[PDB]
Amino acid sequence: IAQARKLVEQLKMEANIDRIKVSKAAADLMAYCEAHAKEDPLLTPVPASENPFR
Amino acid sequence: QLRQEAEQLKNQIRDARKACADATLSQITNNIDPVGRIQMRTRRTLRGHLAKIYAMHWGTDSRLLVSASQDGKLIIWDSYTTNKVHAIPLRSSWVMTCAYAPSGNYVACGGLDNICSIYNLKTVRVSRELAGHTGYLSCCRFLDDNQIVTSSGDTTCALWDIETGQQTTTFTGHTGDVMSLSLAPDTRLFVSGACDASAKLWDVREGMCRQTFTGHESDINAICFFPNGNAFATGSDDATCRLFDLRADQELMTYSHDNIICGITSVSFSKSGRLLLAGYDDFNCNVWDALKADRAGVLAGHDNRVSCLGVTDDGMAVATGSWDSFLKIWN
Amino acid sequence: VWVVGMGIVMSLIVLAIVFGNVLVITAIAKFERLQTVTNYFITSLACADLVMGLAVVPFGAAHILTKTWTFGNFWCEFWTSIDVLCVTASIETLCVIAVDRYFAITSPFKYQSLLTKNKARVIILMVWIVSGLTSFLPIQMHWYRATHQEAINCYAEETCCDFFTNQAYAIASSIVSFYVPLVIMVFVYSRVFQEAKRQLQKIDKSEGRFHEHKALKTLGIIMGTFTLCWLPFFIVNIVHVIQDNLIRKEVYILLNWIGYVNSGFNPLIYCRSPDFRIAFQELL
Amino acid sequence: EDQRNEEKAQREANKKIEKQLQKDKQVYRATHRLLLLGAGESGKSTIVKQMRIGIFETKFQVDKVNFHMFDVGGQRDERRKWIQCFNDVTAIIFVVASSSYNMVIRDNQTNRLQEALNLFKSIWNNRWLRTISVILFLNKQDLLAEKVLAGKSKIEDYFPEFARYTTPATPEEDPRVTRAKYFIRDEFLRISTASGDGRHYCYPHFTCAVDTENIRRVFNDCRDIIQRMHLRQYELL
Numbered sequence A: 001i002a003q004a005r006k007l008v009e010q011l012k013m014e015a016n017i018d019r020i021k022v023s024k025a026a027a028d029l030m031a032y033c034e035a036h037a038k039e040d041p042l043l044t045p046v047p048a049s050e051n052p053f054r
Numbered sequence B: 001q002l003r004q005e006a007e008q009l010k011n012q013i014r015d016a017r018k019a020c021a022d023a024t025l026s027q028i029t030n031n032i033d034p035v036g037r038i039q040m041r042t043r044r045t046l047r048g049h050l051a052k053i054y055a056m057h058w059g060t061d062s063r064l065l066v067s068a069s070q071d072g073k074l075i076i077w078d079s080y081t082t083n084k085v086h087a088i089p090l091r092s093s094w095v096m097t098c099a100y101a102p103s104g105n106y107v108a109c110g111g112l113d114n115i116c117s118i119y120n121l122k123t124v125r126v127s128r129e130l131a132g133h134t135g136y137l138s139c140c141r142f143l144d145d146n147q148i149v150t151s152s153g154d155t156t157c158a159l160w161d162i163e164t165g166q167q168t169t170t171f172t173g174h175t176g177d178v179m180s181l182s183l184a185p186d187t188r189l190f191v192s193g194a195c196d197a198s199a200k201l202w203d204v205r206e207g208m209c210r211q212t213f214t215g216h217e218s219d220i221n222a223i224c225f226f227p228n229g230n231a232f233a234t235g236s237d238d239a240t241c242r243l244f245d246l247r248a249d250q251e252l253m254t255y256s257h258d259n260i261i262c263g264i265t266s267v268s269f270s271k272s273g274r275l276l277l278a279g280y281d282d283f284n285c286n287v288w289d290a291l292k293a294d295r296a297g298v299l300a301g302h303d304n305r306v307s308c309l310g311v312t313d314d315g316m317a318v319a320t321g322s323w324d325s326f327l328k329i330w331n
Numbered sequence C: 001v002w003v004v005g006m007g008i009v010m011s012l013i014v015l016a017i018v019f020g021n022v023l024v025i026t027a028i029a030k031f032e033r034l035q036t037v038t039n040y041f042i043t044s045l046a047c048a049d050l051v052m053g054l055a056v057v058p059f060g061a062a063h064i065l066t067k068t069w070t071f072g073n074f075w076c077e078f079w080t081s082i083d084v085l086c087v088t089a090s091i092e093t094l095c096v097i098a099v100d101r102y103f104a105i106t107s108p109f110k111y112q113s114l115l116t117k118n119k120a121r122v123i124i125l126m127v128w129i130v131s132g133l134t135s136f137l138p139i140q141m142h143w144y145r146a147t148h149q150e151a152i153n154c155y156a157e158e159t160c161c162d163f164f165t166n167q168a169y170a171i172a173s174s175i176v177s178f179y180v181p182l183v184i185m186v187f188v189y190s191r192v193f194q195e196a197k198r199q200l201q202k203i204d205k206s207e208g209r210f211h212e213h214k215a216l217k218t219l220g221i222i223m224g225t226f227t228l229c230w231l232p233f234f235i236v237n238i239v240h241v242i243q244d245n246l247i248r249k250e251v252y253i254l255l256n257w258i259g260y261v262n263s264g265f266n267p268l269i270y271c272r273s274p275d276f277r278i279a280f281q282e283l284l
Numbered sequence D: 001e002d003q004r005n006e007e008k009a010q011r012e013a014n015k016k017i018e019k020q021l022q023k024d025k026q027v028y029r030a031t032h033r034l035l036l037l038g039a040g041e042s043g044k045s046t047i048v049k050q051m052r053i054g055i056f057e058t059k060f061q062v063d064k065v066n067f068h069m070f071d072v073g074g075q076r077d078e079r080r081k082w083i084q085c086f087n088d089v090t091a092i093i094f095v096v097a098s099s100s101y102n103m104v105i106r107d108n109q110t111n112r113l114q115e116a117l118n119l120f121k122s123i124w125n126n127r128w129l130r131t132i133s134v135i136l137f138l139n140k141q142d143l144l145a146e147k148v149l150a151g152k153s154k155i156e157d158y159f160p161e162f163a164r165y166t167t168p169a170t171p172e173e174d175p176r177v178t179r180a181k182y183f184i185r186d187e188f189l190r191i192s193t194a195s196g197d198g199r200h201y202c203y204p205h206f207t208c209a210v211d212t213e214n215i216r217r218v219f220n221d222c223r224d225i226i227q228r229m230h231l232r233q234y235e236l237l
């Protein structure tokens, strides 16, 4: 009963959340990826002089 | 009558999420140039484990790592020189997870025996044994040098206290087994993926669930978390990996292929967040493009299934563990 | 004409012997899974067969075709030494493999302790040392040499290189090389066949109502190829010494070359497991 | 240079570790591991205790051969996600209550036997246990005889297939108990042999409360399992 009630309190709690459109989220993710692109040695092969595994 | 009462709320949540769907992530990311082919060559190979490997966790300095096998042994390696440092026998030979503390002082492990044990590296003897779970442990991550969070098979996750040995907070709400978790960069929130095909977002300080995502169809075996702190990716048994979003509160992209019918056992991101690495049961790994959903390479060389995966803190190398009792370092 | 045709067959055979053995050696070489305690004896066998294919066969082919030995007497002695060493080291390895299978099947609980990677190296080294002690030692020295006038003429001359031997060595080398490693293999495979038949009978008794050919075929092929290849020559060897003039040189040479072929077949017989086939598919 | 000392220290440490790893690997390869699995009310604890005379483990040695057995009790779940960890064991020991056929609930469950049959079918067809044999202990053989002989209840009432079944045999007794026992055993043999593919078999047995020879049966069955695996590996079976 209460457990049944619980699934009601939890459902009410998560119901009222302010949400932004997915366009803003996609833009933020793309901006982050483009900003920190050059600092990814895995994506861009660095010279073997700085590679510690060569 | 109460059970009936709840859905009106679920329908409202679904309607709100559908209203918030302004566009598609694929549509916005349409002019992005492809990353092209990505080739990785094995640089190091680590041997010494007598049986299959179920876990590993890169050190905080991106030099050392720990691994756990089913012969009941933890070995702390050294990636640069491929020579061991420690070998720790275990009381119980069934271990399913391991962790390595951010300060580099402690190492934890647990398994079918419902006990989480930590070890003191700078002294190798057992420091504290934590008990209270009624099922096997799936994962455990060092939140700090004094408190740790674990997820077990009794559909609960708990926050522990090393000095006292007693649970501080208990998280409840899942229906089936819990299989993985991941902590935010600031260690303020963490997510968990269960066997009822649902992922939940918790608050560590308070102890209440904030959101829930139920996009998958089968059990969830792995979960990672975006470097920015506003997204996370999951891997399930239905050969699909999805990318959710905390602010928008629904999924954005799905990664799948018609020629893949096996499962996923591990998921990890890269330093910049552009790539997504996932391990499969077809004895090989795959590399995905996060913003375009297209394969960009394959990592073959394992003779048995892959059960672990991790990327260094500085993003220089990726390590894979497999049931072939071998570890490899790619670059 | 006929000479050119024989030359063609010979050239074609040296190739197969080299290729099969080099292919077998590379795969154990290129893959971690294949290595195993049982897979070192196969490596030793492949190495011996490769050495024989490179060294023994081409020089003998040149001698047969040119009808005269151009090389020096010392090189003739060295060639005979290499021939005997390779032939006698390519059979005791088969005996060792048979014994290993016997231990693996008959004693299932004690296989792990009895065989260890450290003992395999000792066994292989002992086998090769026994092979070399009966090949170089009595041949580089002149303890096998015959006594009749034709033998003296052949030994003194630097143009001809023929094989002449006395009774003692012709019997001792044959006993060491062939006869001893045969009864062991026969006894081992008979025991293995009995065990297989017993297990098949047990399965049939347990669940026959709800639902020995493979074993017979495998044992038959394994025993038959070796016995057919190497049996006639090692009886001709003794006969041509006990009684004079019965066996001509041509028959002796032909039956000797029949034995050389067997090293080609070993990759086909001992490497039909799925792992080796997958490895072969992997490279080349 | 002059750090040339630390490296040497790491090189020494690696060898020190490797020696002990080899020494322990010998013992690890020496021993055999078994898994004990059974349904409720089967009699697992009694059998384990008689053989002796989270996870619970017992070690025994027969003829200088070390055996290691684990019974995982934890707590009940139909999802069994932890069983994928037991795919390198020698064999799986299955214990079933033979006399609990006419026990409808344990509810409105299918007779408990049917639940045991469904569990066995799930175990047999698992993807990670494709090459693991099963040792079957049909426990409680005296209560079954009591229920069959001079018994109001009948097998045909719960299992309609018993109506048109005839004995196949090794009687040791009464004519009814042999038919009942062999029908029950065939009900498992059918499932075992439906999709065996020849890589793993089943070895049914008939145990009781006062039996003392279970350990010898386990020893013999493990020896047969290893011998059959070796025979099949070399293409002789």
Ligand SMILES: Nc1nc2c(ncn2[C@@H]2O[C@H](COP(=O)(O)OP(=O)(O)OP(=O)(O)O)[C@@H](O)[C@H]2O)c(=O)[nH]1
Pocket: D039, D040, D041, D042, D043, D044, D045, D046, D047, D139, D140, D141, D142, D143, D207, D208, D209, D210
């Ligand atoms: N007659 C008979 N009864 C048995 C046998 N084994 C167990 N039992 C019965 O089982 C009851 C409890 O003993 P155990 O069988 O060890 O425990 P259990 O009830 O099987 O518990 P689980 O094995 O966990 O289901 C006793 O009252 C016994 O009567 C047997 O071989 N013969």
Ligand SMILES: CN[C@@H]1CCc2c(ccc(O)c2O)[C@H]1O
Pocket: C080, C083, C084, C087, C088, C163, C170, C173, C174, C177, C237, C256
């Ligand atoms: C020249 N050919 C030799 C002559 C005698 C001989 C051979 C092989 C094995 C032996 O034990 C032998 O005694 C032949 O290969």
